[PDB]
Amino acid sequence: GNIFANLFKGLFGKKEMRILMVGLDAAGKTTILYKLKLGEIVTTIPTIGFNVETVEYKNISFTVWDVGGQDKIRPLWRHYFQNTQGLIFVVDSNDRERVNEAREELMRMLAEDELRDAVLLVFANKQDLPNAMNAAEITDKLGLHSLRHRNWYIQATCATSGDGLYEGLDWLSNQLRNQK
Amino acid sequence: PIRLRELIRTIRTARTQAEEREMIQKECAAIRSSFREEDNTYRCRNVAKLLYMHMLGYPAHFGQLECLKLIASQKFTDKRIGYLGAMLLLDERQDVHLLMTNCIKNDLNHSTQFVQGLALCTLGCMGSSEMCRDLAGEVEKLLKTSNSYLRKKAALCAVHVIRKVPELMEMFLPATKNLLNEKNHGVLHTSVVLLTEM
Amino acid sequence: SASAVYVLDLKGKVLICRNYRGDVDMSEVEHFMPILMEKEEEGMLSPILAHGGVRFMWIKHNNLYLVATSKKNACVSLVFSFLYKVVQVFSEYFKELEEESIRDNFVIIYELLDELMDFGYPQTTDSKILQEYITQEAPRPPATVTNAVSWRSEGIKYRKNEVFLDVIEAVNLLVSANGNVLRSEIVGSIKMRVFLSGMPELRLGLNDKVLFDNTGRGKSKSVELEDVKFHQCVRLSRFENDRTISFIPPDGEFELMSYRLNTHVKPLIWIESVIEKHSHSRIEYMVKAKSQFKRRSTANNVEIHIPVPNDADSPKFKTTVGSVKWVPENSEIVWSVKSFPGGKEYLMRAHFGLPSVEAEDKEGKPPISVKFEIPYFTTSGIQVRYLKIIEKSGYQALPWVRYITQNGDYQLRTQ
Amino acid sequence: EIFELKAELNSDKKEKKKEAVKKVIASMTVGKDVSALFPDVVNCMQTDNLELKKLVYLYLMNYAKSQPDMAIMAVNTFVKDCEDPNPLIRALAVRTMGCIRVDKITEYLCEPLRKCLKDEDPYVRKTAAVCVAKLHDINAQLVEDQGFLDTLKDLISDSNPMVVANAVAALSEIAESHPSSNLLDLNPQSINKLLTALNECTEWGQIFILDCLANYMPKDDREAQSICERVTPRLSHANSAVVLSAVKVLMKFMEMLSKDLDYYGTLLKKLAPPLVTLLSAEPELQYVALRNINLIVQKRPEILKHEMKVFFVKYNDPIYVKLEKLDIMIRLASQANIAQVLAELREYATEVDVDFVRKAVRAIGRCAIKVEQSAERCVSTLLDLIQTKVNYVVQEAIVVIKDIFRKYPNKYESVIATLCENLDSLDEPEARAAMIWIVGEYAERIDNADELLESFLEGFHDKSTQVQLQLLTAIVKLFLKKPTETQELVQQVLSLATQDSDNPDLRDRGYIYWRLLSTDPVAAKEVVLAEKPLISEETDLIEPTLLDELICYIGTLASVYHKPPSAFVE
Amino acid sequence: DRKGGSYSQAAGSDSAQS
Amino acid sequence: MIHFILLFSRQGKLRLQKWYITLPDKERKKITREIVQIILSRGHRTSSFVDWKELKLVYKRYASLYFCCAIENQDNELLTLEIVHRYVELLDKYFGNVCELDIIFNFEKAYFILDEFIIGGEIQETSKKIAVKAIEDSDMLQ
Amino acid sequence: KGENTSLLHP
């Protein structure tokens, strides 16, 4: 066999990668996806089903599959677990009562033997109010350090501002791609 | 990606029931292999083959997520294939149409008159007890428009919602008032049917 | 006591019919198809139907059902034997048993049907004997049918006198899911292709346990055949008297004796398979094949069928020896091995995906069946001792025989 | 088409006549009514070529009843062909003469039949013997007048073993329809002569030779011993029907044999290998073999006592064979192979056939009821099946538990707690009624019997008559046993079954229960909650009179269906 | 050669049993 | 409203199926088999109307392949036949000399035409040219 | 055949 075509394609960029968008409802997941794709704070109705989009950055097509946090859609996250390489968790630091529910949902989704190669991606959404915690208090409460064989990274992203999205994208690219 | 005509000819070439079942399984294996790779180019052919196999009497449970993925796609052929799959292999008792509510809502505000019409037809054909609850607001918005080609679809969707949800008829009374003067025969027939149902 | 022997098709059309008594109307065949359809759709379908006072007993052929209508209390076993004889005659005359020859060989088919049975009582069933009086390409009937010897035509002459034997073994193992074997029986099959001049009276002699005990040599390796079924040429009285197997071999290939005795030894091939099937996520097949047979024997064309999931897709096979391929038509993993030396150990690690949506109905757990076939290996240990070929004219025969060991009903129950 | 075919058949060219005959034969096989051209083909009948004569004879036989009047133009041709030097032509003419169902044609065929009865050719003799039987079946009076019985009887005592077997079969067929008057039975010399030609008969002649002995009844042990010794070699025949016929003959002869002698033991030992060999036959004959084993199992169950491994149903076995395998295992089930039977039933409960699962459950229940030593194992298997979360399996387990409790309820109190909460939402009438009966009769180990019956009383007025009766009986039993927690429940049941219940039997039962409660509640304990006697299990063994008659009818339609020969023929 | 084991010549009778 | 529409061939094979009632797959298959058996076991002078399961099952086949419908007992019977004839005419006009061969291969086109004509069991376009024009415009979109 | 025939023959 010959791999000349593959080498030629990789000389200018061939890897695309994937990504997932899961978390509690009203956690800034749709707004974060809109900011990553377009770059504006778009107001949308609650995600009854799901939203599928793609982001082109660093020569990698970062496809984002937004998943709602509805009760009827919480157990539907297993549908996107098939043929999935990445996973992004959106935390809701502005909902103290919903923080436990989000942590339980993340633990349930992380306790499946089918989703093992998807590295952890914790995004601190709603990072605009004083009640939002830091990048370590939320991780300590969620116990991200206790996830064996899981590469998790906590990043604070402001839905209204958009700061920290570039850092999260760079971290995801570094975790997915292991080349120069 | 085998074409629909080729699959139909292959099915017709089978004489014995066992041979036909073996051919159907051989085609379904390739279809499942293509679907597991997240194929998006020849997805329409795979969807058509799966629908043909299901209509001939073969299981099509594995081809449920593919139809949902194609419903939220952008291609017209892919959207039509997804709508046909949802109408055929999707029902209220399927339990996988809950995620289709978001796709229907997204396609309900589409500027194209074909995607929105297809979504409305699919919603009317496979209306559920919960889909109409979260889709009643959007149905009434399209019923007050002046689109002759969409007025009949809106009337049919409202009739289907009323049949599925008898308590939602109160939201259609102020929308069907002063709608008996439509020049088009289809719009008048839809209005008469809606009035009779109410 | 069949009333009318007819041949049906896959669409319910009677390819050919031949009434023998006329006590059953020819229009009753039309109701056989609806009756069969109703029986199949309700699980009550049986080879013997019942259309009111007429019973339609027939078997299922390759492409048509040879249904033989009857009205009285006819022998069902006799009808089945007649149908089997007719099928064998058709196979001998026509290489293919399908609708292609039914509509093309009617001229000879009608003559064969008329000559085979008269008034519902068959009289001639030997294909070799019947081929000398009914041909598709007529002289007086041969004296073999009238004579006692109806399985060896007289006057056969050949340049050489060579008889080829075939000691084919059938290793059938019924291993339960617990790991133990329930039904482990080996059925012998001595098929010989006799090609000699004249009408020799073969005197088959083997190392039978009963014969060794009678002669006083019941201490060496003797085959303990629980059931021995001799052919028509084999004299039952001679075998019953002193275990003397004396019979006239026929012209061609035929089954002389069919031994069948239980086996209490370990299986030749041991399959240790595991199923690490995740709940709608993936599946693992840690199947290991252990060859318990002698190292001097090689199991050529070893095919251990591993039943994989019906809806499994994107499967991966991590084996050691032999090619592993998944056939979606059969819904199983075929562990095909070309050469399997005795004592070898092949390990495979299957890995296939599964759809997220669960199946609507259960599919069952078909047993895993191996297709091992080791030639020149006799599991039962029975060896041919002598073959007394005696001819009135006097000639030096050159008998030959080969031992072939294969797998019969060697299925392994799944977990 | 028709005109062209008639013109071709009415020509002087043999090449066109043969083509016309072939086309006519193909049209009849293709399903074309060619009986209108029967008179045209009559002229082209006396032909030298044997290829066209057979087709003409077949057309006449198939077009004889349709046009009996036009068949009068073939008696002379048949008479001429009955004297041809070639044995094949004479045999074909004899077969065609007997195959024609013409009342005015068989009368003139007596002379050719008589001439061919003493034919030197064995094929001609067999053809004449077949034609005599055909004529007797068509017209018994004509055959009796022609005196063919004497000629048929002398056929058995002549040479030509195939012809002798054919004559014996024809005589048996004639006597089968005969009223038993002037039977063709023979003394021991005839039996010995038939046995002497049995070893020289063909595969088909063996059945004819062995069927004759099925009617004769031996009178002495020496004659029976000789018959058994001569039929012993038949057990090693490649033909499946020959082995079955030999087994039936041996079973019939064993009725006169003496068990004190060693002949009975040798016959029993030599019959098991034959049954084992027959069990490995074709799937079509598998049902026949299973029926024969079941028929002979109820008569001589000591032969196949140790044959249990071979009764296991295979994965590729047919439904008709799989169902019979369970019945065979149940009939041969014993404490020696109780564990093997339980293991086989457990594996058979994991299949996908609903009918197969029900049959396996019924077989397991029958084995548990028949053998009390495996009652605990059967109960454990039923509990595991119920815990398997299968609707059909759950119903089968509930039915099995209900059946076992009525038979062996002394130590069945350890399973009531497990069955108290076992998915009682199933709506199967055969399972809900059984559960209600078990709760009512076993309302001692369950502390929530009244609470459980509350859910079943919501629709007692419209559930079913049997279900309503079972619920009323359970409520009455609970009130009699524990009237403190079911005092209002009994009154509610009486009100619902006596006022709103329109069932006649149910209304009468409710009225009787109310009268008993209002007359003497203390006496209701000794009247309603009394110790019922031992329940007589339904024995599956056939009646001895039917078994003896079924023994002689082995391998026929009366044996597979397990019915008398006169209860299924028309 | 032939698959399933090479054919071997057979004896005439039990020479050791007379 | 039409509960379900099933286009079955004379041999019993079904070339089209569109049910407006959410029923189980096994139940739907059993209902289709029963409808095929009833239609296949009926003469040519049965009035083309069958009261099966309290449903006015109207059968009117103009060729080898037959047609079926399930209309509730609240409307006229000739309306179903008129709707079936109009649908057949529209399909013939859209396809052009429609035969059994084009139905099996062009099942997607027939399904799209049925969806654009009848939605939810009720009629959507009374005219025969407006529906054809809409179908052509939708097909030309790509 | 019987399938190539037009449904209505128009």
Ligand SMILES: Nc1nc2c(ncn2[C@@H]2O[C@H](COP(=O)(O)OP(=O)(O)OP(=O)(O)O)[C@@H](O)[C@H]2O)c(=O)[nH]1
């Ligand atoms: N004003 C403001 N609102 C925010 C911010 N971050 C998150 N939110 C809230 O988060 C919600 C985001 O919802 P969407 O963007 O539509 O998508 P989502 O996060 O998946 O929410 P659901 O659709 O309900 O599942 C908004 O409705 C906001 O109320 C923020 O930075 N500023």
Ligand SMILES: [Mg+2]
């Ligand atoms: Mg969202």
